[PDB]
Amino acid sequence: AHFKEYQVIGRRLPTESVPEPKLFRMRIFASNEVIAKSRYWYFLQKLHKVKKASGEIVSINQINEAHPTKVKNFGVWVRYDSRSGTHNMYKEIRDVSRVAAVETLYQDMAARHRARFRSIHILKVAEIEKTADVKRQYVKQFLTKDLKFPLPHRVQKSTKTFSYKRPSTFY
Amino acid sequence: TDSIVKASNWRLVEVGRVVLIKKGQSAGKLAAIVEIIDQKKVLIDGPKAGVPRQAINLGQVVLTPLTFALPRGARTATVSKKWAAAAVCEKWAASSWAKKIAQRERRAALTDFERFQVMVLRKQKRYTVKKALAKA
Amino acid sequence: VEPVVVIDGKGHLVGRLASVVAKQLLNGQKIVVVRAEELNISGEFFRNKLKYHDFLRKATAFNKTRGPFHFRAPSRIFYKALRGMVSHKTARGKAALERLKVFEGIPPPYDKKKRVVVPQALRVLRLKPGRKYTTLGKLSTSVGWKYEDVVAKLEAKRKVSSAEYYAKKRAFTKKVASANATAAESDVAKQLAALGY
Amino acid sequence: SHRKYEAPRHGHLGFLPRKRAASIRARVKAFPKDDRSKPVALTSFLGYKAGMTTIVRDLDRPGSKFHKREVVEAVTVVDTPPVVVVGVVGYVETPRGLRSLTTVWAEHLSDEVKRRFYKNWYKSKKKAFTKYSAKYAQDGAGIERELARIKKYASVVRVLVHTQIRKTPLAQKKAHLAEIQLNGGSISEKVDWAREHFEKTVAVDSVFEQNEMIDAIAVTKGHGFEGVTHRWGTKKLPRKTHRGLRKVACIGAWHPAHVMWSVARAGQRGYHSRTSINHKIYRVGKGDDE
Amino acid sequence: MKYIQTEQQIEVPEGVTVSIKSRIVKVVGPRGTLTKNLKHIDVTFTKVNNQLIKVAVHNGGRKHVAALRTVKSLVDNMITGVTKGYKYKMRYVYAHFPINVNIVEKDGAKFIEVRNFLGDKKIRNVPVRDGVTIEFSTNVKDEIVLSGNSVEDVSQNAADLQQICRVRNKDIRKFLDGIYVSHKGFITEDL
Amino acid sequence: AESHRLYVKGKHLSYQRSKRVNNPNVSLIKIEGVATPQDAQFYLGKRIAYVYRASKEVRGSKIRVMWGKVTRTHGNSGVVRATFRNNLPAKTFGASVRIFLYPSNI
RNA sequence: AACUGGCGAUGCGGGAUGAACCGAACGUAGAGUUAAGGUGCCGGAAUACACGCUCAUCAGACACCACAAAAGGUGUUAGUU
RNA sequence: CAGUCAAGCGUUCAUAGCGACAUUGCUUUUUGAUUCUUCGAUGUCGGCUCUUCCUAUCAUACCGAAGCAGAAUUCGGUAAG
RNA sequence: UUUGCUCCACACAAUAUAGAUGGAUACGAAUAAGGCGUCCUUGUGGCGUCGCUGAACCAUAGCAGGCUAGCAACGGUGCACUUGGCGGAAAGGCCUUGGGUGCUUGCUGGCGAAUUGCAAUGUCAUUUUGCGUGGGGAUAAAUCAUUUGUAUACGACUUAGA
Known part of the structure; x- marks a missing residue:
């Protein structure tokens, strides 16, 4: 579904010798809470000696975008598995939210490298609104002062199967 | 002799270009383009007209001939101030494009009585105009 | 739902047009398609030329007169495209195919009549700009169609006769506009404006 | 497996089927291309193959071993009395080919040409073109209308002519009617020439001249049902072949599980339409002289 | 992108x-x-x-x-x-047989005709384009000039002069005979 | 004047079917001017009549009728599902049907 | 050979087609939902929406399954140093 | 029957032509392997005859390359007309 | 060869409508462009304006459209006719100048309708037939058999024959 940024705070189960464990937290983009808690145990199993059975999740929360109607430059660092091996890349994309850029990121990763969600780890989603922090020319071109372009060859959708005049693609 | 070139200037998408939302919750409202996001998406706002600030594909709106001076990235408050002073809402209404939309909706709302009233008036108008061609 | 829909094939994609027409014929809409030679196929001419040569290879080995019949006329190539979209071996399919006529150019019963377009199948709406495409007339000629030059002269004739009628049509319409301008400022016209007309 | 030794196939696959021609008169399938510059002329003629003889002539071939030396040549003598121009046909070009728009005929038709319109001529009322000929004999009442219909349409015009079979020794006495395409001038002159030459004979010395390569279209000598040995030229099977040797041994492999169209089979031999090309006119000779 | x-x-x-x-x-x-x-x-x-x-x-x-x-x-x-x-000048390169080039006008069509290319009897005809003018310059032998408004026609003509003069069935490293374009300039450069 | 229609023009498209099995008890009907399911909801429950002619006059008529109703919509493109008192003969695929304005709600 | 599930003994929906695969196992009917599989036309069902990528003078197009490899290409795209 | 790598051959040069050590394949014009079909029977070797198809091209068309200076070859391309 | 055949118009008609129920409502070309209006260079330009769907445009009221009666109009439409043309790609249809003849809802009246009972398609547009009706219209061939050999297994073919 629509990716939602969840904060997931969990810990290892409290034993007698070690009450109050170290309370690790992650921000993971997921469709829903069930996948959020699942993705949490998957990564926390990767960085620590803990699995779902031996730990508990102490807080699950949604993080909302601070201002969902300002467009920003998002610096995305990702590792993914291709058929041959593993690679780390830094991509970047315009958006208004962290989540929709991550939705965009998974679409681009699937399209350009045939990477399924199973294969992708989102290392760090970073926002910058200051130029010269933007490295990719496919994003720099929308930051030129006084941007303006046409939308040539406008194709208009037809509700009916027949029309009674050749179409016009003017704009 | 001047190097004649067909002018060929047409409806560029830019900050401050007013657009019509053709599908969605708005479906027929005005909104100024507030900030360019990509080649096919853009941030728009229709506060005076009644469209919330949102991201939207350029294929979900149709650009219009009109625009006004609107600084890039202005929130709903600054956009509505510049929208009012430019009378872009009024200029759209006086345009022929809006008159066809208003004519379309007004004709659709016509009742069965009002449709019969059209029928009589159209026969009357045809009688005088057909007479007018015959004499000259 | 018209008694007969007459479509001009100029600037249309053969496959998408064949798909739309086949559905219309099955649903009971009689269709005639004109300008079969100005139909379009996506891909360069060499691509679509090779494909028809591949179709030309296939023939019954022990008797070539019973194999696939490779019709070269642009109208028959469209007809072949459409018949592949119709269950033509059933009685219902024969009836749907009967409701269709395809022509090169516009024969006399239809150049006085309305021509429509199918935006789903139009080339200037469908193909990405810059993408190479094949015109049906050139393809058919290359594989043995003989009447491209005949049609061009008869299409040039029909168009120039069709140009006079439109200029006559503009003559008749301008007399309405200037006479209506003098029959203007009428209360009836004002009343209709308030009532949506 | 492959044939042990290669050999060319027996016979031409482009002269198929080896069937009886539709008629005894072989028609011109393709008349010469029209040139609008050249004057109006016939492009074909009808005559009767009488027989062969032999001739002697001095060879002119500067580089041959028989240069300036005498040679003996077999020749074919074609009995060619003049043909009567009776009727014209107009053909408008269409995206479906040439379509005969109308045929305009002549005032009077002889007994020979009118015999072609009957299968039992002797017990009939001879009602052929009688009510048609009532359309003639005025200024322009119905005469010119058909002609001008051909003029403003009908990109291809072909006159109708027939043979004077009564001038030949044959007992047939029924004319052969065929179209001959005019391939000169403009369209109007073609219709005009046809009109002026209506009902009058055209001589061979106005169509074909000396030292000219012509083509001949005829139906070959018929021979009936033929076995493969002489119909196709296949090898005779060995003398000790059980149940027949004038045959093709294998008429096909197991697969395709059919007899192919390309395998030589017993069938009709001869009596085919044939268009032979490149025959030189060695002499055009008149009949009104020794 | x-x-x-x-x-x-x-x-x-x-x-x-x-x-x-x-x-x-x-x-x-x-x-x-x-x-x-x-x-x-x-x-x-x-x-x-x-x-x-x-x-x-x-x-x-x-x-x-x-x-x-x-x-x-x-x-x-x-x-x-x-x-x-655009002015293109060619040079006829030949080791033994002089290359004989003239301009013929059959029905006024202005063909390029090349004779004696490696002593062969085949006579090469190259129609010129409308908008390119054949010129035979003095002050240097074995050279053909042709100037025209469209570079496309002058260069296509020049290539068509080269094309008919390719040597066949031979080592072309040794048998270098032909008409090769040598100058590709303008008629009135800096003038 | 010359127009006297009170019903809507409709086409009998097919029986309800899977790829290889059809159910004659249900007919798929196109409504003229309906291209979306939302516009087809107006016609739900409305009477339908396939009107046909026979050479034999039966009860003072040579015109015979099968009646039905629009039971629900079908697909995303304005086709509707219809059941008739007797199932339609299936030679009438592509034939014309009449969708009436009754029973009415407007 | 092992465990299990199946076919044999089993129709039905899907994989065009097929003993075994997917779905689901079956009294006779009706209505409503679905499964697997699909929704340009054949053919019921969006020529839907959204982002990319690809142009093939042998494109590709869906598990079982009706095959293709090593090695290469400033063709194009993204990414790493 | 093809390919990749390229130690080497090719007079002082891998790649004109070749090409070891390796390694990737393709084909079913070999022979094995198997036993699915046929034992209430599918006539078996070869030749003769005759047709068609394939291309992994011997010849003929056009061409690229060479250790092609001419002749003759060799390698390769499009090509089964 | 006991009134045959053809054209056309009517009183009645059939294996039936792959499916009427106001109207298939004519430029062409381009689509990184056009349409229309207008101005001006003995010519491929300037200035306006439209599009962003046909949700249009024609036609649309009257017993399925009755009987009638008037008006400030010199229009519009159907029909039996008439005069000029145009259209061959499959034209088989388009425009017509004249008369008559209806209608006209352009505007205003009078009378009628009802009981089809609260819906029942509630029936309104051809091919073909009869010792059918009547106004015209010009009064043939093929086949067998005979014959031929440019043909031929037989059929078929090419010929001839009052």
């Missing part, structure tokens, strides 16, 4: 005037007219100051931008054509 905008600027001399309808460009100058049907790139043309024309590609892929520069470059060639013209 789909670059949003790319532009190239043509600079027209003071005496030349360019006409650009839909995608047909008509460059007119002292040496006459030059036309081009260019309906296969989907480009745009803009007038700036009667001496500048801007050719732009919007939302173009990599191949689209590459064709933009060619369209620009073609228009200089027409502008260079009327202002200057």
Whole structure:
């Protein structure tokens, strides 16, 4: 579904010798809470000696975008598995939210490298609104002062199967 | 002799270009383009007209001939101030494009009585105009 | 739902047009398609030329007169495209195919009549700009169609006769506009404006 | 497996089927291309193959071993009395080919040409073109209308002519009617020439001249049902072949599980339409002289 | 990548005037007219100051931008054509057999005729284009000149002179005989 | 004047079917001017009549009728599901049907 | 050979087609939902929406399954140093 | 029957032509392997005859390359007309 | 060869409508461009304006459209006719100048309708037939058999024959 940024705070189960464990937290983009808690145990199993059975999740929360109607430059660092091996890349994309850029990121990763969600780890989603922090020319071109372009060859959708005049693609 | 070139200037998408939302919750409202996001998406706002600030594909709106001076990235408050002073809402209404939309909706709302009233008036108008061609 | 829909094939994609027409014929809409030679196929001419040569290879080995019949006329190539979209071996399919006529150019019963377009199948709406495409007339000629030059002269004739009628049509319409301008400022016209007309 | 030794196939696959021609008169399938510059002329003629003889002539071939030396040549003598121009046909070009728009005929038709319109001529009322000929004999009442219909349409015009079979020794006495395409001038002159030459004979010395390569279209000598040995030229099977040797041994492999169209089979031999090309006119000779 | 905008600027001399309808460009100058049907790139043309024309590609892929520069470059060639013209000079290279080149006029069609190429009896005929003029310059032997407004026709003619003079069935490293274009300049450069 | 229609023009498209099995008890009907399911909801429950002619006059008529109703919509493109008192003969695929304005709600 | 599930003994929906695969196992009917599989036309069902990528002078197009490899290409795209 | 790598051959040069050590394949014009079909029977070797198909091209068309200076070859391309 | 055949118009008609129920309502070309209006260079330009769907445009009221009666109009439409043309790609249809003849809802009246009972398609547009009706219209061939050999297994073919 629509990716939602969840904060997931969990810990290892409290034993007698070690009450109050170290309370690790992650921000993971997921469709829903069930996948959020699942993705949490998957990564926390990767960085620590803990699995779902031996730990508990102490807080699950949604993080909302601070201002969902300002467009920003998002610096995305990702590792993914291709058929041959593993690679780390830094991509970047315009958006208004962290989540929709991550939705965009998974679409681009699937399209350009045939990477399924199973294969992708989102290392760090970073926002910058200051130029010269933007490295990719496919994003720099929308930051030129006084941007303006046409939308040539406008194709208009037809509700009916027949029309009674050749179409016009003017704009 | 001047190097004649067909002018060929047409409806560029830019900050401050007013657009019509053709599908969605708005479906027929005005909104100024507030900030360019990509080649096919853009941030728009229709506060005076009644469209919330949102991201939207350029294929979900149709650009219009009109625009006004609107600084890039202005929130709903600054956009509505510049929208009012430019009378872009009024200029759209006086345009022929809006008159066809208003004519379309007004004709659709016509009742069965009002449709019969059209029928009589159209026969009357045809009688005088057909007479007018015959004499000259 | 018209008694007969007459479509001009100029600037249309053969496959998408064949798909739309086949559905219309099955649903009971009689269709005639004109300008079969100005139909379009996506891909360069060499691509679509090779494909028809591949179709030309296939023939019954022990008797070539019973194999696939490779019709070269642009109208028959469209007809072949459409018949592949119709269950033509059933009685219902024969009836749907009967409701269709395809022509090169516009024969006399239809150049006085309305021509429509199918935006789903139009080339200037469908193909990405810059993408190479094949015109049906050139393809058919290359594989043995003989009447491209005949049609061009008869299409040039029909168009120039069709140009006079439109200029006559503009003559008749301008007399309405200037006479209506003098029959203007009428209360009836004002009343209709308030009532949506 | 492959044939042990290669050999060319027996016979031409482009002269198929080896069937009886539709008629005894072989028609011109393709008349010469029209040139609008050249004057109006016939492009074909009808005559009767009488027989062969032999001739002697001095060879002119500067580089041959028989240069300036005498040679003996077999020749074919074609009995060619003049043909009567009776009727014209107009053909408008269409995206479906040439379509005969109308045929305009002549005032009077002889007994020979009118015999072609009957299968039992002797017990009939001879009602052929009688009510048609009532359309003639005025200024322009119905005469010119058909002609001008051909003029403003009908990109291809072909006159109708027939043979004077009564001038030949044959007992047939029924004319052969065929179209001959005019391939000169403009369209109007073609219709005009046809009109002026209506009902009058055209001589061979106005169509074909000396030292000219012509083509001949005829139906070959018929021979009936033929076995493969002489119909196709296949090898005779060995003398000790059980149940027949004038045959093709294998008429096909197991697969395709059919007899192919390309395998030589017993069938009709001869009596085919044939268009032979490149025959030189060695002499055009008149009949009104020794 | 789909670059949003790319532009190239043509600079027209003071005496030349360019006409650009839909995608047909008509460059007119002292040496006459030059036309081009260019309906296969989907480009745009803009007038700036009667001496500048801007050719732009919007939302173009990599191949689209590459064709933009060619369209620009073609228009200089027409502008260079009327202002200057394109002059190509060939040289007949031959070790033993002199190459005999003259211009024939059959039905007034102005063919190029080459005789005696490596002593062979085959006589090569090359029709000239309309808009290229054959010239045989003095002051140097075994040289043929031809000047014309369109570089395309003068160079295609020049290639057609080369094409008929390829040596067959031989080591062409040794048998170098032919008519090779040697100069590709203008008629009135810096004049 | 010359127009006297009170019903809507409709086409009998097919029986309800899977790829290889059809159910004659249900007919798929196109309504003229309906291209979306939302516009087809107006016609739900409305009487339908396939009107046909027979050479034999039966009860003072040579015109015979099968009646039905629009039971629900079908697909995303304005086709509707219809059941008739007797199932339609299936030679009438592509034939014309009449969708009446009754039973009415407007 | 092992465990299990199946076919044999089993129709039905889907994989065009097929003992075994997917779905689901069956009294006779009706209505409503679905499964697997699909929704340009054949054919019921969006020529739907959204982002990319690809142009093939042998494109590709869906598990079982009706095959293709090493090695290469400033063809194109993204990414790493 | 093809390919990749390229130690080497090719007079002082891998790649004109070759090409070891390796390694990737393709084909079913070999022979094995198997036993699915046929034992209430599918006539078996070869030749003769005759047709068609394939291309992995011997010849003929056009061409690229060479350790092609001419002749003759060799390698390769499009090509089964 | 006991009134045959053809054209056309009517009183009645059939294996039936792959499916009427106001109207298939004519430029062409381009689509990184056009349409329309207008101005001006003995010519491929300037200035306006439209599009962003046909949700249009024609036609649309009257017993399925009755009987009638008037008006400030010199229009519009159907029909039996008439005069000029145009249209061959499959034209088989388009425009017509004249008369008559209806209608006209352009505007205003009078009378009628009802009980089809609260819906029942509630029936309104051809091919073909009869010792059918009547106004015209010009009064043939093929086949067998005989014959031929440019043909031929037989059929078929090419010929001839009052």
